[PDB]
Amino acid sequence: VTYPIFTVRWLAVHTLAVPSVFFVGAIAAMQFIQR
Amino acid sequence: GTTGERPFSDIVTSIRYWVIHSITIPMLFIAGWLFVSTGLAYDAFGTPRPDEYFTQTRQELPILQERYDINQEIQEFN
Amino acid sequence: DWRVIVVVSPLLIAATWAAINIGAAAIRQLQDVL
Amino acid sequence: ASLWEQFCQWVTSTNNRIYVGWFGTLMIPTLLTATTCFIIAFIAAPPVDIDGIREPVAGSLLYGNNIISGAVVPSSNAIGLHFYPIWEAASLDEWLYNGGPYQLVVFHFLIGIFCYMGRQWELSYRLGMRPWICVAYSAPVSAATAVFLIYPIGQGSFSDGMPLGISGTFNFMIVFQAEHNILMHPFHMLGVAGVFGGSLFSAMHGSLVTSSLVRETTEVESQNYGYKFGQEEETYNIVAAHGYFGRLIFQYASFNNSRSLHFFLGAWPVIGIWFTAMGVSTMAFNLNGFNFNQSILDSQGRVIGTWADVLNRANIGFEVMHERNAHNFPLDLA
Amino acid sequence: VELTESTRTIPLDEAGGTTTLTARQFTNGQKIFVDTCTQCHLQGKTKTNNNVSLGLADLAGAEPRRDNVLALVEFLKNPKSYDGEDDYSELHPNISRPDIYPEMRNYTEDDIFDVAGYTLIAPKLDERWGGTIYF
Amino acid sequence: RGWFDVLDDWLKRDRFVFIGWSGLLLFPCAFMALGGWLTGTTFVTSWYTHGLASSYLEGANFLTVAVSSPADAFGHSLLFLWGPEAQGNLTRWFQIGGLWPFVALHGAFGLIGFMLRQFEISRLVGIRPYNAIAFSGPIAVFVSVFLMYPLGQSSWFFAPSFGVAGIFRFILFLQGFHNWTLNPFHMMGVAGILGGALLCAIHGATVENTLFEDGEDSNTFRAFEPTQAEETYSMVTANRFWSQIFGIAFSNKRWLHFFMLFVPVTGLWMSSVGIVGLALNLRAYDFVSQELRAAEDPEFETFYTANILLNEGMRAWMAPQDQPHENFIFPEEVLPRGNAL
Amino acid sequence: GGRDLPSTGFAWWSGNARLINLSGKLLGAHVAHAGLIVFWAGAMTLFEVAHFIPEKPMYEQGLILLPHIATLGWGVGPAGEVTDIFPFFVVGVLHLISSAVLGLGGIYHALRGPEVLEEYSSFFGYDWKDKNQMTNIIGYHLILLGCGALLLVFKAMFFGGVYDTWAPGGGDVRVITNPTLNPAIIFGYLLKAPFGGEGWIISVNNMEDIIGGHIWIGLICISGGIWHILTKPFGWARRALIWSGEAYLSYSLGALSLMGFIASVFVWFNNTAYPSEFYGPTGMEASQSQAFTFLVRDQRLGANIASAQGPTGLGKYLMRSPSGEIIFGGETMRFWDFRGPWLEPLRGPNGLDLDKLRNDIQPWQVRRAAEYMTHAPLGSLNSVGGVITDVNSFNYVSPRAWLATSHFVLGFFFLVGHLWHAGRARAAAAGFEKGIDRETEPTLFMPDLD
Numbered sequence A: 001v002t003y004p005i006f007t008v009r010w011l012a013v014h015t016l017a018v019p020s021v022f023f024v025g026a027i028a029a030m031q032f033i034q035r
Numbered sequence B: 001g002t003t004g005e006r007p008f009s010d011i012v013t014s015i016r017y018w019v020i021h022s023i024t025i026p027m028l029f030i031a032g033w034l035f036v037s038t039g040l041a042y043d044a045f046g047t048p049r050p051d052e053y054f055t056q057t058r059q060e061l062p063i064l065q066e067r068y069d070i071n072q073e074i075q076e077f078n
Numbered sequence C: 001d002w003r004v005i006v007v008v009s010p011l012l013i014a015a016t017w018a019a020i021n022i023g024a025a026a027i028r029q030l031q032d033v034l
Numbered sequence D: 001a002s003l004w005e006q007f008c009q010w011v012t013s014t015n016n017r018i019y020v021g022w023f024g025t026l027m028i029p030t031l032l033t034a035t036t037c038f039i040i041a042f043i044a045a046p047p048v049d050i051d052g053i054r055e056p057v058a059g060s061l062l063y064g065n066n067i068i069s070g071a072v073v074p075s076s077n078a079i080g081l082h083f084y085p086i087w088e089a090a091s092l093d094e095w096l097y098n099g100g101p102y103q104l105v106v107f108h109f110l111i112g113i114f115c116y117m118g119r120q121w122e123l124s125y126r127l128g129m130r131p132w133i134c135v136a137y138s139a140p141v142s143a144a145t146a147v148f149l150i151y152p153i154g155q156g157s158f159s160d161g162m163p164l165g166i167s168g169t170f171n172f173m174i175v176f177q178a179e180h181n182i183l184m185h186p187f188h189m190l191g192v193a194g195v196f197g198g199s200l201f202s203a204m205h206g207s208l209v210t211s212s213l214v215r216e217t218t219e220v221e222s223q224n225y226g227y228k229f230g231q232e233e234e235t236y237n238i239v240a241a242h243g244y245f246g247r248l249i250f251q252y253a254s255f256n257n258s259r260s261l262h263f264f265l266g267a268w269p270v271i272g273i274w275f276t277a278m279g280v281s282t283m284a285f286n287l288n289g290f291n292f293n294q295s296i297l298d299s300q301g302r303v304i305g306t307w308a309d310v311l312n313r314a315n316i317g318f319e320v321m322h323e324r325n326a327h328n329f330p331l332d333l334a
Numbered sequence E: 001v002e003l004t005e006s007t008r009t010i011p012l013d014e015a016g017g018t019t020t021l022t023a024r025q026f027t028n029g030q031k032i033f034v035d036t037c038t039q040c041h042l043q044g045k046t047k048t049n050n051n052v053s054l055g056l057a058d059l060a061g062a063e064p065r066r067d068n069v070l071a072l073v074e075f076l077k078n079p080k081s082y083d084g085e086d087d088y089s090e091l092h093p094n095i096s097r098p099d100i101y102p103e104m105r106n107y108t109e110d111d112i113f114d115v116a117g118y119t120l121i122a123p124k125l126d127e128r129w130g131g132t133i134y135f
Numbered sequence F: 001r002g003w004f005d006v007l008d009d010w011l012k013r014d015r016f017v018f019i020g021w022s023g024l025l026l027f028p029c030a031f032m033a034l035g036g037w038l039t040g041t042t043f044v045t046s047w048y049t050h051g052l053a054s055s056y057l058e059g060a061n062f063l064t065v066a067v068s069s070p071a072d073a074f075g076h077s078l079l080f081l082w083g084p085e086a087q088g089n090l091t092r093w094f095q096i097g098g099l100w101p102f103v104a105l106h107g108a109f110g111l112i113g114f115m116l117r118q119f120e121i122s123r124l125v126g127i128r129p130y131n132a133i134a135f136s137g138p139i140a141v142f143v144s145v146f147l148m149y150p151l152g153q154s155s156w157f158f159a160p161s162f163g164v165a166g167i168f169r170f171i172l173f174l175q176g177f178h179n180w181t182l183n184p185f186h187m188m189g190v191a192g193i194l195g196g197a198l199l200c201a202i203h204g205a206t207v208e209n210t211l212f213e214d215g216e217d218s219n220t221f222r223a224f225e226p227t228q229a230e231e232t233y234s235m236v237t238a239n240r241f242w243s244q245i246f247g248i249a250f251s252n253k254r255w256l257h258f259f260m261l262f263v264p265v266t267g268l269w270m271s272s273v274g275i276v277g278l279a280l281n282l283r284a285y286d287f288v289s290q291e292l293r294a295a296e297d298p299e300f301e302t303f304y305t306a307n308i309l310l311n312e313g314m315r316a317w318m319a320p321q322d323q324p325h326e327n328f329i330f331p332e333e334v335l336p337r338g339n340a341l
Numbered sequence G: 001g002g003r004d005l006p007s008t009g010f011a012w013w014s015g016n017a018r019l020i021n022l023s024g025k026l027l028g029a030h031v032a033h034a035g036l037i038v039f040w041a042g043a044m045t046l047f048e049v050a051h052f053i054p055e056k057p058m059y060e061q062g063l064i065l066l067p068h069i070a071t072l073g074w075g076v077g078p079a080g081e082v083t084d085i086f087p088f089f090v091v092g093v094l095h096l097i098s099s100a101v102l103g104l105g106g107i108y109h110a111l112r113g114p115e116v117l118e119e120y121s122s123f124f125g126y127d128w129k130d131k132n133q134m135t136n137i138i139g140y141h142l143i144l145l146g147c148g149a150l151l152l153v154f155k156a157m158f159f160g161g162v163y164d165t166w167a168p169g170g171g172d173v174r175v176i177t178n179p180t181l182n183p184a185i186i187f188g189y190l191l192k193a194p195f196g197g198e199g200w201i202i203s204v205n206n207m208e209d210i211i212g213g214h215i216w217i218g219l220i221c222i223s224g225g226i227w228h229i230l231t232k233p234f235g236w237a238r239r240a241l242i243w244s245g246e247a248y249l250s251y252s253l254g255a256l257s258l259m260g261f262i263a264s265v266f267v268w269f270n271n272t273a274y275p276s277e278f279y280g281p282t283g284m285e286a287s288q289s290q291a292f293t294f295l296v297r298d299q300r301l302g303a304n305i306a307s308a309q310g311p312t313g314l315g316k317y318l319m320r321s322p323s324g325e326i327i328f329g330g331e332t333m334r335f336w337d338f339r340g341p342w343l344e345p346l347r348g349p350n351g352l353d354l355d356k357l358r359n360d361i362q363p364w365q366v367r368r369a370a371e372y373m374t375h376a377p378l379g380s381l382n383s384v385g386g387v388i389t390d391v392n393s394f395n396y397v398s399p400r401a402w403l404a405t406s407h408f409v410l411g412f413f414f415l416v417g418h419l420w421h422a423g424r425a426r427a428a429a430a431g432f433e434k435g436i437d438r439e440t441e442p443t444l445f446m447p448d449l450d
């Protein structure tokens, strides 16, 4: 009950997840590059 | 048994989390997409595009040989 | 560079959208941690 | 009361110092046969024409080998998959020249280890145990059968079996990489994850238990004397171990259940070795690892190499040099 | 660099006349090469007889020389020996014998032109084209 | 209450992810390492150091991407971003392979931070620090392989590259150039790793098959409580089973678990000693007696001599593309090859 | 029936064990699963038809189902050339539609039908411990298996024939007229050694022996079906076996593991039931094809192919098998037991004949040998053909390789499943599958070993 939103665990989760999704979108764009 | 943070299953089943992450995760995805598809990643990391592995004046591997002056070496390599 | 703005503006949109959807409770938590 | 029932009671007896059982009636003769012939051949067997090209390879200690280089050399390529027992040779010297001891040792050994697996079930049944230790032992058995039986069957020659020696094993591995790219085979990758992870989990489990032992000794004597064989109580604090490991990573990455943890310990290297045994068993039929040679081309069509291409150059070197007088034709098809 | 016009510019006959394939014709010839030729002519070798490879020196040394598009198109209609003496129409895949070579029976004249063009362009993209079997 | 004790209170708070004092070393450095790997394999080429594509941006897959080692012309230069090679240019730093010493040094310090975390949590929980002592094996392997081996060689170029097929290349390289299979230090490592996998499998299966019936379900996993005092499986039955099957058995659970620690850690340490030997080309390459006999008698052949021929062929065929900075021009006629291949 | 752990004692990850004593839901599981098998048969056939280029050889095209139909004699002519695409399409459509029927029936029995069939009918309701009913079900299913083998016989003898690769004039669909009813040949195949030159039942080299075996199998399975309907298990069988549902499952698992291994070896070695016109060459076939191709090529250049020694002193092209037969040289000496319709015309009583090699080699034998040596079952996991050191331009892995690898792996994992279910059946019947009872632990009453 009345948990904090932003924690050390929040920063931990986003430090990895946010560039993870950035990189996954980048590699998905890479799949359509032609020779 | 719980360190005090909100449990993950209570978070990812909440309406507010999905209102926010229904925009934030597609925006990060298409930001990475635009990093690649605009060609910005090539100039940022120095990675050759498929037409710049070899030039008209160089048909060999551009293996670095200078100890220090590698900026001039790579420019020459083009 | 138009490429840098084109890439960075989804990040600004994501930060903005999360800020409108969380900012009242984030202000509340910041007041709770003084 | 009958003689046969008395023999059945002795064979299946839990009071025997080494359990025999009905699987043991097959395992003991076969393993003793293969052990005797292996020791004699490793010490004293004459050179074996393994490749069938009249170029005999010396494998035994008395013919100039050491412990590292010594081997019981596989049977001749001229034999192939043909059954070559002692009585089908015109003399013992011909049987020795053609690699008959390899067929004798391998066939008895393989029967012996399958009966060892069955004997593990059998003793678990006679002791009132759960029966699945033999399922775990099926993974080294599958790997041994893959390299001694299944790969020769797929390649059409026992000459392609793993030699019974240390440097012969290395020769087998290197030629296998040259011909199959086993490193780039996802099932060997699971094998490696199996053995690397199995050693990791062996060290973590052993370290966590030793870290959390209940104080029962002094620091003069060894801590192992704090355990009595047959004691009812647990000798370490699983809650302390869990409270350590769930702070080392996070709480729900840590086993609080000892049965769940021990299952995971059993299952991970067994599954990994099952996968790599199937990798070798499928590369027997030349379903090889990943080929990414010239996968990347520039816009003109010039090859841009990767690490797979450099690995392929290494594979070429091995291949064009192996069994260097055996090939008469442009392709190594088997 | 790009797949330039000069890279796709190859001799057409023995009189110095040249031709320039398009990118579409190059890709169609490469596809026909992968689908039909590579089982024996992977990387320009010849797995069944590597004395007669698809390398440029070997194509130049044929009688008459096969380093132009018209001679290659004539070879794929009537294959001969390397000295042009023995009839090889029952021993080499060709468009003139569909009854024994059904895989080539749907390839048009422009398909043969494209695969001949790709056979002429591919050695200048690869230094190992037409070498030994293990190389 | 002084500021140090207040900071120690905050760093050692019970939270989903424990930080501690060691986290100040562990969490940035590891994030520098792993992200530095993930950046490189996604974006960064090895075209100017190796003549190779090694990123997803160039079309390589997960098996073929790497953060490849730097160019051999730099020697053992640490290749700082501000250093005399890149001179603060980020793009040039990426192109010359500066991401390799970035990931290797941040990884080294991150591994140090992780061992310090093991010590810190072991002290705060109240247990003995044998998890950290066990983790010395992986640190010995990392330090010997990724640091000491290229430091003994000409440059950072001959260090393993942080990729799947790059590691495979390093593996085959040490075969053909060092005969690393013939090295007893490696053979002890193989014994330790396969023995640790054996011990993991056999101990897990033995426990799961000598379980006490402490519940009614066929699901035996819920018949265990973490606060229970009794053993969940029969040590006596397990000992009798393995004594009759195998000849010997564990009778002491503490020795069992210490052995489960001891075998793969000793294997890692012994293989590290061998890698330190290979750093100076101090190889177990040859048996000189068998070489002299084979040189004087052309009928003598063993598997060892066959492996020597295999290494010779791999060296000659691999060196021009693997060491492109050396400009090895080996014509086709000098390459060793058998008949018809 | 319980659908949770508290009421069954089985977790979710072992849920289908909640059906052991629920015969109606068990039947629905069994019948829905059959749906799935017939669904894959039909949908995979339609996929293979849709991707088929019929002038191109089936084995170039990743097909494992159209070769099975073509071997039965449908849609093919001489040399396995595709006459019509419609029989393959028909086989696909009929399986796909029927699979819909089987899936609807499994869902019924599984979700709506009675959970136990024993209170509804004595004929269909079974107890696992009822040895008469278990053997009755064996018997019904044996009569059906014998009818299936006789249906293969009827297709070969009465309804158009099967593809014979060994047929004179070239391989063709032919009607089998004189099947081998001689039990000496049929069961001497069972008596032959599982080694080189003998090959057990993998060495069946003619369609007459295959069709005669299926007449005998049909007769044997029908007779064994009636036996098991009319009889009950005897005392030695009752005292030797475990009588439980898991036990019967494990017996079937060991049986399936054995047939998976046999199928992998069959498709790897046998070119009669698996004709090389559809499946491509075997590995032995391709190696002998390479040796023959270069024998022909060097003979055309004027080499004396019989008097040519190689570097080792053995004959470069021709040499002697260990029993003396004149065979091809190099490493293919291993494959001198290989027999094929392109090669057997050049064989004499002593082996390969010099006169036939000099003046009887036809151009089609050269074409077939070149095609088979370049379609050797060597390939990468991403389907790059040839040796693994080759570059990426040949998209080919042999159907023999795919089928053999698959069935070997399946066979191994079904042996593992046999060990798991047999061991568990033994422990559950003996009463200690859930663990050692602490009070009556058997080791605590045994004497010490030393």
Ligand code: CLA
Binding pocket: G001, G002, G003, G004, G011, G012, G013, G014, G015, G016, G017, G018, G019, G022, G025, G026, G028, G029, G030, G032, G033, G100, G103, G104, G107, G110, G111
């Ligand atoms: C071949 C696959 C297969 C089959 C046929 C079955 C069949 C069955 N399972 Mg098992 N199961 C399987 C795989 C399978 N399972 C796997 C892989 C797992 C692990 C996740 C389980 C785990 C499991 C548990 C834990 C339990 C079962 C149970 C059951 C039985 C009752 C199912 C029930 O109540 O569902 C109710 C489910 C639904 C009503 C959801 C809808 C399901 C339908 C069938 C969807 C069909 C879709 C299909 C496209 C429609 C086609 C219609 C027509 C055109 C043909 C049933 C006989 C239960 C049991 O033992 O009963 C006592 C049970 O407790 N299963």
Ligand code: CLA
Binding pocket: D271, G040, G047, G048, G051, G061, G062, G063, G064, G381, G383, G399, G402, G403, G406, G407, G409, G413
């Ligand atoms: C006996 C089974 C079998 C066999 C031999 C084949 C063989 C083939 N299929 Mg088919 N297929 C099958 C089942 C089978 N398939 C099934 C069940 C499906 C439905 C999912 C399909 C769907 C299918 C399609 C849609 C296509 C093929 C194609 C192909 C061809 C290329 C295969 C390829 O590239 O694989 C790549 C290799 C892999 C993906 C490796 C998979 C490894 C598995 C997962 C390992 C499993 C191990 C073990 C069982 C797991 C147990 C774990 C536990 C016990 C511990 C080849 C002829 C292609 C083709 O050319 O057709 C014209 C094609 O397009 N198949």
Ligand code: CLA
Binding pocket: G027, G031, G101, G102, G104, G105, G106, G108, G109, G113, G114, G117, G120, G124
């Ligand atoms: C192995 C398969 C199998 C088995 C053993 C059963 C058994 C049973 N079913 Mg089920 N059923 C099945 C498949 C099966 N069914 C399929 C596939 C469907 C979907 C069409 C159904 C749909 C179904 C319904 C809707 C009902 C049953 C019912 C019953 C029960 C009464 C049977 C009866 O009246 O028989 C006597 C009937 C006959 C003797 C006439 C039928 C003869 C068959 C159908 C003709 C030939 C079979 C087939 C076409 C041959 C080729 C098959 C091919 C796969 C080789 C009995 C327990 C009833 C039930 O639950 O009772 C409470 C019920 O209401 N079944």
Ligand code: CLA
Binding pocket: G135, G138, G142, G190, G191, G220, G221, G223, G224, G225, G227, G228, G231, G232, G233, G234, G237, G240, G241
């Ligand atoms: C798949 C179908 C099937 C199934 C499940 C069964 C199941 C059974 N049969 Mg039946 N049987 C079948 C088909 C089948 N049979 C057919 C088709 C026939 C007609 C030929 C018979 C004729 C038959 C008779 C005459 C008898 C049985 C009996 C039995 C029972 C005991 C069998 C036993 O202990 O074997 C275990 C086998 C042995 C103990 C023999 C040991 C010999 C060694 C182990 C053979 C090893 C061979 C090796 C593993 C593989 C080599 C392959 C090949 C070269 C041989 C059991 C219920 C018995 C019974 O109780 O009657 C009611 C009985 O007397 N069956």
Ligand code: CLA
Binding pocket: G012, G013, G014, G015, G016, G017, G249, G253, G413, G414, G415, G416, G417, G418, G420, G424
């Ligand atoms: C026809 C054969 C058959 C049948 C009917 C059964 C039936 C049963 N098994 Mg057995 N089993 C079999 C074969 C069979 N098994 C084989 C071959 C093995 C060896 C691998 C096992 C090993 C085995 C174990 C270890 C156990 C059982 C158990 C059980 C029971 C519960 C099963 C369940 O709910 O699964 C639930 C299903 C799942 C959880 C999903 C399985 C996931 C697998 C790994 C997927 C494999 C991948 C596949 C190839 C496709 C790849 C997809 C990929 C692309 C993602 C049930 C009585 C349990 C038992 O003892 O109960 C008494 C049990 O613990 N089975």
Ligand SMILES: CC1=C(/C=C/C(C)=C/C=C/C(C)=C/C=C/C=C(C)/C=C/C=C(C)/C=C/C2=C(C)CCCC2(C)C)C(C)(C)CCC1
Binding pocket: A015, A016, A019, A020, A021, A023, A024, F031, F032, F034, F035, F036, F038, F039, F040
């Ligand atoms: C380099 C560098 C740096 C650093 C950076 C960083 C630190 C970062 C990062 C980063 C990151 C951090 C990134 C990321 C990522 C990611 C990714 C790329 C992912 C992925 C994934 C996937 C794809 C997965 C998948 C899967 C699988 C396979 C299994 C199961 C399922 C799933 C889906 C899960 C700096 C600037 C400082 C400086 C300069 C240099």
Ligand SMILES: CC1=C(/C=C/C(C)=C/C=C/C(C)=C/C=C/C=C(C)/C=C/C=C(C)/C=C/C2=C(C)CCCC2(C)C)C(C)(C)CCC1
Binding pocket: G028, G029, G032, G033, G034, G035, G036, G039, G046, G093, G096, G097, G099, G100, G102, G103, G104, G106, G107, G110
């Ligand atoms: C019980 C259960 C289960 C299972 C289920 C199953 C197993 C099923 C099934 C089912 C099935 C088995 C099905 C089916 C189907 C089919 C269909 C639905 C069909 C069809 C058809 C059609 C429609 C066709 C069409 C066509 C034609 C006619 C020709 C041309 C082409 C085409 C394709 C168009 C599970 C696991 C979930 C779990 C829970 C319980």
Ligand SMILES: CC1=C(/C=C/C(C)=C/C=C/C(C)=C/C=C/C=C(C)/C=C/C=C(C)/C=C/C2=C(C)CCCC2(C)C)C(C)(C)CCC1
Binding pocket: G185, G186, G187, G189, G190, G201, G204, G209, G210, G211, G212, G213, G214, G216, G217, G240, G241
């Ligand atoms: C169709 C065909 C044919 C024919 C075939 C035949 C005629 C057959 C057969 C078959 C048979 C006739 C079989 C069988 C089998 C048997 C088995 C597989 C067995 C067994 C065993 C068991 C299982 C036992 C067990 C045991 C013991 C060991 C003792 C104690 C008790 C018990 C029960 C545990 C031919 C090749 C001509 C050609 C191709 C096609």
Ligand SMILES: CCCCCCCCCCCCO[C@@H]1O[C@H](CO)[C@@H](O[C@H]2O[C@H](CO)[C@@H](O)[C@H](O)[C@H]2O)[C@H](O)[C@H]1O
Binding pocket: A019, B043, B044, B045, F039, F086, F087, F088, F089, F090, F091
């Ligand atoms: C999440 C992924 C993380 C990886 C890194 C991503 C960042 C993107 C790369 C941007 C590269 C910018 O490209 C390069 O930047 C460097 C900054 O170091 C500039 O460098 C310039 O300023 C620096 C700063 O004093 C000078 O030391 C240097 O000599 C000069 O060239 C280069 O002129 C520019 O070409």
Ligand code: OEX
Binding pocket: D051, D077, D155, D159, D160, D175, D179, D322, D323, D326, D332, D333, D334, G331
């Ligand atoms: O013997 Mn033993 O290694 Ca199977 O691959 Mn062909 O064989 Mn020989 O070569 Mn490469």
Ligand SMILES: [Ca+2]
Binding pocket: E035, E036, E039, E103, G060
């Ligand atoms: Ca073709």
Ligand SMILES: [Cl-]
Binding pocket: D171, D175, D321, D322, D323, D324, F306, F307, F310
């Ligand atoms: Cl060799």
Ligand SMILES: [Cl-]
Binding pocket: D326, D327, D328, D329, G329, G330, G331, G332
């Ligand atoms: Cl050869």
Ligand SMILES: [Fe+2]
Binding pocket: D205, D209, F203, F207, F257
């Ligand atoms: Fe333990």
